[PDB]
Amino acid sequence: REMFAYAKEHEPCIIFMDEVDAIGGRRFSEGTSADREIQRTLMELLTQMDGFDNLGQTKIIMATNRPDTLDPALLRPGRLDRKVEIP
Amino acid sequence: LKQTENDLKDIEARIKEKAGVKESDTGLAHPLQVARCTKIIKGEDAKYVINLKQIAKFVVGLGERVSPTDIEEGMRVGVDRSKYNIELPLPPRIDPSVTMMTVEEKPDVTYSDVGGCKDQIEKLREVVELPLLSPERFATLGIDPPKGILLYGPPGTGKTLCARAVANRTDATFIRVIGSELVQKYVGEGARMVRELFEMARTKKACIIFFDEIDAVGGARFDDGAGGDNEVQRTMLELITQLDGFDPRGNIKVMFATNRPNTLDPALLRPGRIDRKVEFSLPDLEGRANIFRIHSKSMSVERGIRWELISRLCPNSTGAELRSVCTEAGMFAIRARRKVATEKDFLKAVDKVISGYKK
Amino acid sequence: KDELRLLQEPGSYVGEVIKIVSDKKVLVKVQPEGKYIVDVAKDINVKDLKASQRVCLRSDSYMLHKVLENKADPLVSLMMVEKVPDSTYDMVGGLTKQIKEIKEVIELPVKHPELFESLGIAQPKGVILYGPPGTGKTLLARAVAHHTDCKFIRVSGAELVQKYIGEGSRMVRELFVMAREHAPSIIFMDEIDSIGSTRVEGSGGGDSEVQRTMLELLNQLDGFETSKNIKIIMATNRLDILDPALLRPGRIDRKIEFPPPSVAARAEILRIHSRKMNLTRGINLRKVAEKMNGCSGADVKGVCTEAGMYALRERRIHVTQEDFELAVGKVMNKNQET
């Protein structure tokens, strides 16, 4: 939230995320045992984008080990429109 | 006559307590676990008022300041668990409980649980009996005794009594520190007690300092880094520095005890901390043959029996469980109207404790 | 002008009298602070001070000022006592077996307490409901404290426990204080309920702090206080992570199950909810329940809203017989949809 507000107050800001597989992932049965922090981060990233306040000039770069192990809800258009491999 | 003198202590002295005590207690004022003042501001210099409470913490800089008795307000002046800057001299860590341990000089117990196990005896004869007898030969030998002795295995099996057996011929003072009583809710007392061990050991030499169940308090835990209490951290600083560097180990020895050897402090696993390691195993038929003969010497029973058959009825088990067998020997004999334990009395006594373990 | 001088006050705390001191003082426990020995008012004799008596202690001089009314002011989370409960047994009616088991447990000792003492058996002080989820027990919960003319009270064990210092105890003990003065009342125990009204499947990991308090107050109320006409009503369909000792006497007394649903069970329920609606003469309500599959009491209750939507598109207050079967087929398929 504070990063979302700091990006709106200060336009020249670039956010870079590294190894989001720890905060992301489908896990196994989609159940939660000490897992509440994984869903806590993912749900906030998707909720700030589809709200009435969007980010016009703010760019957020995410990185992970595999794209297929992430949340498919983020890969759909309307929030994350850029999927680019790095060979 | 004496009725007036009884109340006189609470009457005549109360008049002096009005002016005298209230003046000494002015400023909103022997183990003390909380050092804090209330709204005390003086000056610049001679202010201090260090507060350990979460609200309104303070620190004092500008070099070193040492006072013999009164620093600022006297009394509640203290440090406790959080060391604030430069002031050592007045810790409120003194608890006159330091006699809680057991100090036995020249123990009269020679063979109790030690008999029957050959391997554990010979390992402790070279590093204990010899230096406590003729330490001068080790100065000519060129090497030094090990800085620590690792004893791991089942507790209460004679691991502690094995140190008392070797100390008998050398007439060494046996000092045992029980890990159960070592763990206390007071933070900061463990650093003082360990420091007083080496200071007192220099007064009377030829002593052995033993520690029981070190894993109770632990050599390595998750409360050191994550937690806010300092106990084992300051204990290891006083354990390694005091003993190893300036203190000769000839007349001063430190022996620990534990169960799982891999759960100890990894700092001790490095070279230069603990060298001698002795492994304890369950006694066999020959190992338990001499154990029941020693315990039966105190009690009065029939001498025409054989203890090698009694030890054969019970399988391999910890030596701490063998003591409960002797307590059951003099019981079933009463049911048979026998003041002493006959040969048939030990038959039903051993078979009773075997089914109780359910192993 | 005289009111302006009265509006200036240093303030006064709130406490309760504990005991009486021969020194012309009194020990009063201040709820936000603690137990403090204060002075008794000069215009109020010390003989009028009773146990747990609500009084007023000044903030400035820390002493008794006057004697207010005697009551325990509740801290309100979900536990506020309501007024004029609105329900009836004719709305949830149609279940013959369940009503007979509720009356002989809850309502029986309230109306005639002498039947248990003369027979030689203790009156049941609690009952645990059994059955599938969503049988319509949410509406009859208001009628339990209504027809019996008791005080409506709901208790949430989660909101009365906080990690703050002193906030996980005084809240729980507040329920025990008012339960004695409100004694002609029925206490509702939630958050353990698996019956399906509100079903969280119980909480075994969040109650670790409250088990040291609430479980002591519930057992001490029956045993030590011997206060009758107080019904502690719990619910669940399974005991696994809860207290294993509930089977002992003093907690579980009677067990009310639920009758198996059938045509005759849903035939009376559909007729009750259709009284507020308007049906064309010649429609059989018993044939509607025959085509239903796995429908509980709440499944039939939801058909009323769906049945009125088809007739609203045509803008008619009277629902034709054609729209009922089309609505029931949609409600029955809600669980089997996709």
């Binding site: - | 909380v34 804090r36 159960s180 469980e321 | 005991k19 020995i37 002493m63």
Partner: protein, 362 residues
Amino acid sequence: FVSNSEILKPFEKKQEEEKKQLEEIRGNPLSIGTLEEIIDDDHAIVTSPTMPDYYVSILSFVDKELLEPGCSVLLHHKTMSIVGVLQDDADPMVSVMKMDKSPTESYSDIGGLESQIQEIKESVELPLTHPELYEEMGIKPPKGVILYGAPGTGKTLLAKAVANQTSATFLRIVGSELIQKYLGDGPRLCRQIFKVAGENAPSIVFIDEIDAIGTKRYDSNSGGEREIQRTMLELLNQLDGFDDRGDVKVIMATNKIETLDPALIRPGRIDRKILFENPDLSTKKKILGIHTSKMNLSEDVNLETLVTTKDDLSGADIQAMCTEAGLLALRERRMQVTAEDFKQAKERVMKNKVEENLEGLY
């Protein structure tokens, strides 16, 4: 009244001057503190419920023998010094203490539990009546007894049955009350158990239902409490350190011993582990006599007929058997329960436990 009118009345008039000097030190704004440690230099530690931990000086009011560490005292807002001690008569110092001298339960009234009597008699009555038998063997008779099963039959009857023949005072202490509401009272309550029963000691201490304090887990934090370790560590030293001729006795009760602290067990001090035995025809009639006393029954109702054919139920199902029999009379609107209700309710409870044991095994 008449005698004290010429004694106490002129006494209070001459003692009024000393009371005036007291009230000046007392003061109107008092407060309740908490003691920690008492030293001979007239100093102590006090705390008000807002937790401003202080250190003050002890004045002269009452003798120091009335002051004990871990108690509550009176304070004043000036120097926060102790102006007096709070009366402990209202607030119980221990957890649960019930002194029963020469109880009703005996060895012959508990039924077919005699198999358990022979074990407890040798570890309790034998060292008390003939202490010289253990002196020849040089052994320490175990003072502890470990009980198994459910209360109301094995634990309830045998607890008070051992005190009758031994002429001992029965003290019942709740095991779930070992952690009591306050920090620092752990070692205090452990000594008060042996102190009150240590002066005379015709008594046997009884403890039951410990599901918690016997478990210290892996630490004292992250869900654990420090009060748990204060009582457990002090109980081990008081039980192992104190030795006698068999007067003082401490008996606990637990359903599962695997969760208890093995260091607290201290093998060799307590050698007595008593299992649970099923009740015979004699014990089952004792449980029925309590409930059927107030329960209405005709002349054809006999306690021997009900116990003849039974699944050998515990104390919980036997109590529920007479409970279901009362519901048959309430549904029929009658205050007199016939003999058919006891037989009908007996079959229902019997079928709710063991019937065919999932018939099988070829």
